[PDB]
């Protein structure tokens, strides 16, 4: 048997175990249609990748912030980076939308037509924008070291590791958000605060978490 | 606010109850056709025990708090009702019958409860409403009547 998200319940019919991180977790049956499930697969992978990258950013910047280097904490870095160098806010946002819109649109229309961008329309590139699977766009640009086309079972292991770490990162970033909303301080500052007095500094003491 | 949250929770309870009794455990006919049991349970349980419970709430919260509010003290200084449940001596300050506890009730000496179960008639002249002691006495008699 597979390990299920809830030992004892059989897994739903549309979830089999061919995917990565497949634990049969779908109580609302949101992914019953195969196209909808395929789209949600891509959604989970993208959210996970941005979450991993973001939480790495938060943790590293906070490590640099507690030690006396002069880094701002993550709720202040936007203001001080825009303010301190010279940068006009809206032009930066607009260029963000330019580049992100270009690449993200390429991804969208590669989902609609699965092998369309490998035609040569972009400057000269062929078979380096052809996708490998759903949400795994491995070529020379996106898998430069070349891990996807060797050691297939070990590659399945890498898929499993990616999905697990991504989910952990997503709930980690949610942790950063709600944690800052509750305590109003930096995250690794909270880690050191809880690590100094574990029995008396936790969520059951802020007065905001449990209002009883 | 707490009452609001409680109301919402009871609402979810009711919708789940409806789903349960149509789809999972649906009664047969002859459950419904026992009108005599339904009469007993409604008359006793719903009307009667509701009256008795609300009499309890009036006697232990609504009489003293309104006595203080009509006495003139602002509402914040008034003790919270769980202090009225837990501390007998505050009730003994307000209505001295409570200093004797529930001994008058079980020995049929009900005449000593004339401080918070009254029969005065008209209105509260400082307020414009009915006397709440009458209201509590009323629900007590109602509950005895319906439970009988």
């Amino acid at each position: 048997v597979r390990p299920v998200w809830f030992p004892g319940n059989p897994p739903p019919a549309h979830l089999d175990g061919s995917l990565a991180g497949d634990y049969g977790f779908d109580p609302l049956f949101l992914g019953q249609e195969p196209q909808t499930l395929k789209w949600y697969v891509q959604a989970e992978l993208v959210h996970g990748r941005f979450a991993m990258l973001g939480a790495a950013g938060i943790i590293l910047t906070s490590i640099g912030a507690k030690v006396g280097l002069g880094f701002p904490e993550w709720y202040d870095a936007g203001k001080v980076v825009v303010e301190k160098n010279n940068i006009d806010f809206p032009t930066l946002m607009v260029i963000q939308f330019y580049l992100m819109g270009w690449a993200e649109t390429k991804r969208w229309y590669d989902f609609k037509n699965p092998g369309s961008q490998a035609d040569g329309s972009f400057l000269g590139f062929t078979e380096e924008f052809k996708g490998l699977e759903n949400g795994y766009p491995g070529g020379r640009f996106f898998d430069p070291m070349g891990l996807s086309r060797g050691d297939a079972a070990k590659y399945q292991e890498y898929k499993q590791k990616e999905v697990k770490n991504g989910r952990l990162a997503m709930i980690a970033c949610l942790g950063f958000a709600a944690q800052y909303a509750a305590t109003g301080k930096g995250p690794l500052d909270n880690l050191a605060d809880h690590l100094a007095d574990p029995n008396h500094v936790n969520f059951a003491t802020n007065g905001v978490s449990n209002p009883i | 606010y707490t009452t609001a949250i409680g109301g919402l929770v009871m609402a979810a309870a009711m919708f789940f109850a409806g789903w349960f009794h149509y789809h999972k455990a649906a009664p047969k006919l002859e459950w419904f056709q026992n009108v005599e049991s339904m009469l007993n349970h409604h008359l006793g349980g719903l009307l009667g025990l509701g009256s008795l419970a609300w009499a309890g709430h009036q006697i232990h919260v609504s009489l003293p708090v309104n006595k203080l509010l009509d006495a003139g003290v602002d509402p914040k200084e008034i003790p919270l009702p769980h202090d009225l449940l837990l501390n007998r001596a505050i009730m003994a300050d307000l209505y001295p019958s409570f200093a004797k506890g529930i001994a008058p009730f079980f020995t049929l000496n009900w005449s000593e409860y004339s401080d918070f179960l009254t029969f005065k008639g008209g209105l509260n002249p400082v307020t414009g409403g009915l006397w709440l002691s009458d209201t509590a006495h009323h629900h007590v008699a109602i509950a005895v009547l319906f439970l009988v």
Binding site: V1, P3, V4, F6, P7, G8, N199, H200, N202, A204, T205, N210, I212 | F20, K24, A25, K28, H82, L86, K100, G101, I102, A103, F106, T107
Partner: protein, 203 residues
Amino acid sequence: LPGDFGFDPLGLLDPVNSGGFIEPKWLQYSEVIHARWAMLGAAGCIAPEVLGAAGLIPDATNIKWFESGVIPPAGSYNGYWADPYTIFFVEIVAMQFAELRRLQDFRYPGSMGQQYFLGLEAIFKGSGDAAYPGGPFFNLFNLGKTEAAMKELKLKEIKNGRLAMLAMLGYGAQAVMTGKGPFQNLVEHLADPVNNNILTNFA
């Protein structure tokens, strides 16, 4: 089947046209669970008073059972290693695992010996019945080892449990009315029987 004493005037053990949470195979299970928790709780409510009266624990403890921190209005105790909320979160998580897995054994019998749980799998197989799992840990020593003795132990479990349930209701009622501990009530009533009763303590 245990504890069947010819009782039940209101008629709840009729299998015919039954369902939901009122059926023979859930009401009996509920009886045994309530019996076990009631035994445990009864001993727990008595123990600090008797241990403190015999002088075995110090007098920082020897507090009445409703003053542990269960009802913070009635009196709490500072000196635990954390706040009662921090205790309560641990309670939520641990009891969640235990009670929830127990539920999974009731709904799907035998389905608790497959998925990896740190190797604790031969212990949680259960048995044919659902209120008496057994196994190497719920039945450490093989108590009885037969059939003629097993019914006797089940029956004694049931009767002790029923006695415990009535006892625990007694502790609750007494703690409401007289406001003292249960061992305090035993001492006061064994002092003066006629002058200490329920009817003398009508105030």
